[PDB]
Amino acid sequence: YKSKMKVFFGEHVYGATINFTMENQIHQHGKLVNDKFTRMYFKHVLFEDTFFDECYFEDVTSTDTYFKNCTIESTIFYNTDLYEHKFINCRFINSTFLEQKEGCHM
Amino acid sequence: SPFVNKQFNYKDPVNGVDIAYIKIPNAGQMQPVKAFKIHNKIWVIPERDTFTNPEEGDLNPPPEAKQVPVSYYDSTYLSTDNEKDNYLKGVTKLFERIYSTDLGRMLLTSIVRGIPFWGGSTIDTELKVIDTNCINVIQPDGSYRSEELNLVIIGPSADIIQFECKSFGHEVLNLTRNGYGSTQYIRFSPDFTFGFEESLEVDTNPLLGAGKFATDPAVTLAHQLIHAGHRLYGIAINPNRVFKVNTNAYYEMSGLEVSFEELRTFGGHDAKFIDSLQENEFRLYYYNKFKDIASTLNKAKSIVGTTASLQYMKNVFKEKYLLSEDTSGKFSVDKLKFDKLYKMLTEIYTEDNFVKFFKVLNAKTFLNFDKAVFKINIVPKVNYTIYDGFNLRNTNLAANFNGQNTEINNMNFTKLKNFTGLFEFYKLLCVRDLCIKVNNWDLFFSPSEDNFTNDLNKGEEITSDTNSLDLIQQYYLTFNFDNEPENISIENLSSDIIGQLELMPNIERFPNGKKYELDKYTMFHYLRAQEFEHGKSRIALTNSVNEALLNPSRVYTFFSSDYVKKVNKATEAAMFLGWVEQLVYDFTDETSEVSTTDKIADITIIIPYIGPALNIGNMLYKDDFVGALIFSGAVILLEFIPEIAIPVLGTFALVSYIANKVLTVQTIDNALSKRNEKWDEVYKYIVTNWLAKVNTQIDLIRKKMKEALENQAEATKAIINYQYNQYTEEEKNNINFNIDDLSSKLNESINKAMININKFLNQCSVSYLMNSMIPYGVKRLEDFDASLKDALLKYIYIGQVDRLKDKVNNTLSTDIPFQLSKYVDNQRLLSTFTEYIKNIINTSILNLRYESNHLIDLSRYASKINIGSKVNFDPIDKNQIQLFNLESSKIEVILKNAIVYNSMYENFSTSFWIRIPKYFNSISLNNEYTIINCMENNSGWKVSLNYGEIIWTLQDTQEIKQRVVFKYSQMINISDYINRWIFVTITNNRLNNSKIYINGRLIDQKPISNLGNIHASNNIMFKLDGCRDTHRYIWIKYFNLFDKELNEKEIKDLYDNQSNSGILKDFWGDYLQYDKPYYMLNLYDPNKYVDVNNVGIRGYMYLKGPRGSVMTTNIYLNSSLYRGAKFIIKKYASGNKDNIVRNNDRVYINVVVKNKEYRLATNASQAGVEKILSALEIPDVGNLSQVVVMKSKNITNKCKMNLQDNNGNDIGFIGFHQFNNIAKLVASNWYNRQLGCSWEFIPVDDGWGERPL
Ligand SMILES: *[C@@H]1O[C@H](CO)[C@@H](O)[C@H](O)[C@H]1NC(C)=O
């Protein structure tokens, strides 16, 4: 598993709606602007130094994913299990945290 | 024991002791005239006065009428025996009536006792009678017996109804003003009485009709007796001391002479027109005169011209002047006894006191001029009883003074034709024609500034020792009786007593018919526009004065257009009776109207029609009149602005005694006492100025309002009568209409309106007194207090310094309250003054409020309210002011320079409602920006803000700073201070502490006593200064400043009053509104939001959580509010056209689901107390209970909804019940039996910053 780890550097993802499952990836210095994660599975994916922007998280189920040093701005986390403990040294900006799936899901 | 014993009839013989031919002094030779003595030293001569004055030898009217409002001329009066006997009986009855009263008894005893002084001897050591102060009664044997007398009563001169007290003067001595005294001849007639009109009696008898009251002759005789009593002791003021006025302007009386003697005699309200300095000067002058005559009495040791022993004469003069001998024949005056005697002769003996004792009507002030001449009969007891007068007991005249009303008691007074024409003395006013003549006695009374003088500026040095009917009753017990100067034999004088009357100053004739050209329509023009001639042709009302003055047959009216349309309409007989009733209904409606706007300070009852009634301020719109009133205070009512200027009060020079311990404490006590005396004296001077210059104009405006209302009523009555006159005989007899009942009901409506007009004018006068006159004196007094405090503290600089310093600091830190009860005795005005004092806001110093599209200082202390071009006002409620972070988004308040004192801001309070949006940018942290500034030269107080902090800063010149802060956190689930209105108040006392309260609860306090010189400022800056955040802004409203520390009770009262409990409020504290979508929040469970479930009958609504979270790291973390289904409020039965909801309104509730509206209804027939709510499509069944009554009061408990059935039965308060697992919404009656019934409406706001996904 660990051999097939995808390293991502310097991304600029604009206006993309994500519907599938992405697994075993790390993102560094990403700039996820106006994205949308709806009804998907996060599996062993790591975010570092990524700058979110007005992204929308809906019915996203996460496992072993962890946000680090990310600037998260103007986002909405509705119906999710991405609890507080999944965020490490992250700065929120004008963000929100609405209904959140109860219990972790795998 | 009656005054006059053994009634004299007229034709009794010429005996020589009680009824005899006498020869009074005269210029030449006079035939002896029959005169009757009625008591000791009192004679009556029932003849016309053609003897004393040689000029007054004729009884015909003069070619040039006098400057007199009412006068009757006659020639056949008192020429027949019956007339003389009737005159005698009337005079005797009036004397007995005066004598019965305790005050009258004292007056008559004093007049009888006070014989004229014997100063006719050229040599200084002799006493000789004045040759002109005695009469000659000729005995039937043939010789005369010269006798000394005090009073003489003579029938009037050519002018029948002109009563005056004359005296016989001396060659070198002014007997009537140097204490010697002289005989007084009164020209009085009881058969005639002036008639006045009273319009301030309705407060006791609302059923009273018109005025036209007749003056009781007893009061007039008492006035003349008071004049004689003043002149008998020689303490009368010189006639040239006259109350001068101004006559140049068009609104001023052409001429009205009123001497200081008349002001003293009138007493009561009139006597206050002379300041205390002139009273002091007169008292000192007459004390010196009494000392001089006492010394003259002491020096003399021989008497020539009489048999009686000298010692008896010295005793007589000692008991007259209350001199104090000391068992060595050394007469001397004492200040206490002479002060008592002067106060009795000046203040106790007054016409107002006689009016109070007699309990009769009279003109409360000399301005209420007489109007008619009434011939009356006094001799019969059936018309005038000795004890009561015209107000006979046990009859219809007993109550409401109906005995003095000529329109009830018609048979007792006969109206006579007075010779002074209505337009004999007039002023001719007109605009740039239509020139109208206005009678001189119908113009404003404007006293000049010369009559008021002050000794305030002069300084004072302090040393070791520097210092009501019950009162009349106490004087009555203290008074001395049983000692009346016995008759003395005087050697007879010459047959002809040569003597000339006291010389009077020449009064120049005021010019008549002055022509004035103006540029506006004055109030006299409007009054003369409403008059008419009772002509034969029809009279139509109109609303254009330019045509009413021009056309005689059309009268101006200030009522609505509907009324003038109605009264101009030709109506048949079949509708005449209904027409009249409609007309009286419209009369009552228009006259009883009042103004709703009350935010004004104690001008609560504003009468609108007054504007068009007199053209007040030169606008002809009632709405414009109310706007101008609120904008400019009570100034617009005044025709001329009084000029009041208090000089800089003098300093107190304190003497120091070497090595003394008790006297210095006495000096400190004396300084504090004299401080209180200075405060009282300045207050009294200001009250006197206000009474003389302001209240008179208000009284005139009141009288003119009454006259205008009477004119309108008479015009309507004339129109009705003319329409009635046109019918045929069968029409008149079948349709009967009478005039008396119509007149009575119109008069009652006029009285009902007049009560409100009087209340409004009293409020205006008191408001002007407390707003524009008192502060100009308070500034001087408190500046003087500050100046004296430093001198006192330097003076303390043995062994008692701490207590004395505490005493002086606490004494001079505060101020003496102004209570009107110690300066005026008018009940009607004192009640309104107490109402003024009651409200705390009325006593505020700065009262910035938005009124009539203008931001104005309702307390009238501010000179300039400067407004920037980038300051926003909320359209729904214009009071809320929004200030941005721009250089041009500022407000400036510039106070009046002559009201602000240097030592202000020592004890003061401030209060304002502020709304502060959430802090978003991280720059806001550790950033303090001033939002209110009052600092100059780095000194004063400023209100600043910071991240979750409200700071109050007080700084002095020495750079010392004291801060009180209120800190509220932003990291909370639900905050009561973030983007919500909060009522901040701050109270500073220099002595102890400075405190800050938030929402009426004490929050913080800190000492400020260490501060030095906090030098006061003049500008107030509402501007965000120093804020690094670029989009920062605040909301501020209801700013108020107070000149005294506020306790907790006053703070809570302010919070309750300014909260405006009548209007329901949303979450942020704004006004709840119709047709606006609000999210719902429950206070019982604030962690869950309202959601809907299958809209329809079978669905419901429940509460589910958690709400969520809205966060910005290191800045804030608050639970989201824009969640759930939004509620909107649709009107149902609110008649108000605005969308603002109020208490007890009935409303419909709509819930939005999928951007579609569903009515909030339920079926009340389901079992159990709980009635689960539901959402139904708006085309639902009306049988389901849906109407919701909104309430905000029980004490106020948030905003509650009460579901009601269609039949008025109360389904109950809205709320939530945990019906099984799902917590549904229910209309429960358990909540009606007082939580969970309190709700909060959260609308989308731009200060919260949450995005409604
Ligand atoms: C991918 O996105 C499309 C577009 O909305 C959607 O039709 C599809 O269902 C998504 N894929 C899955 C596995 O749901």
Author numbering:
A (entry chain A): 423 to 528
B (entry chain B): 1 to 432, 452 to 486, 495 to 824, 831 to 1227, 1231 to 1270, 1278 to 1296
What did the published study say regarding this structure?
Botulinum neurotoxin A1 (BoNT/A1) belongs to the most potent toxins and is used as a major therapeutic agent. BoNTs and BoNT-like proteins share a common domain organization and are produced as precursors that are cleaved into a 50 kDa light chain (LC) and a 100 kDa heavy chain (HC) that with the exception of BoNT/Wo remain connected by a disulfide bond. The LC is a zinc metalloprotease that specifically cleaves soluble N-ethylmaleimide-sensitive-factor attachment receptor (SNARE) proteins. While the physiological functions of SV2 proteins remains to be determined, their best-established role is to act as receptors for several BoNTs (BoNT/A, /D, /E, and /F).
To elucidate how SV2B interacts with the toxin, we prepared SV2B complexes with the inactive full-length BoNT/A1 (in the presence of a 20 molar excess of ganglioside GT1b) and HCA1. Although applied in excess, GT1b was not detectable in the complex structure with the full-length toxin. The SV2B-BoNT/A1 and SV2B-HC structures revealed that the HC domain binds to the LD of SV2B, extending one β-sheet of the β-helix fold by the antiparallel β-hairpin located at the convex side between the two toxin HC subdomains. Unexpectedly, BoNT/A1 binding to SV2B resulted in a switch from the semi-closed to the open conformation, the domain arrangement that is observed in the crystal structure of the isolated, full-length toxin. Notably, based on our structure, in the open conformation, the HN and the LC are positioned far away from the plasma membrane or the synaptic vesicle membrane (~40 Å from the lipid bilayer margin), suggesting that this conformation prevents BoNT/A1 translocation. During intoxication, this state would correspond to that of a receptor-bound toxin on the cell-surface or after uptake into synaptic vesicle prior to acidification. Because in the open conformation of the SV2B-bound toxin the LC and HN are far away from the synaptic vesicle membrane, the role of this conformation appears to be the prevention of the interaction of the two domains with membranes and premature translocation before the toxin/receptor complex reaches its proper destination. Microscale thermophoresis (MST)-based experiments revealed a high-affinity interaction of SV2B with BoNT/A1 and HCA1, with very similar KD values of 110 nM and 180 nM, respectively.
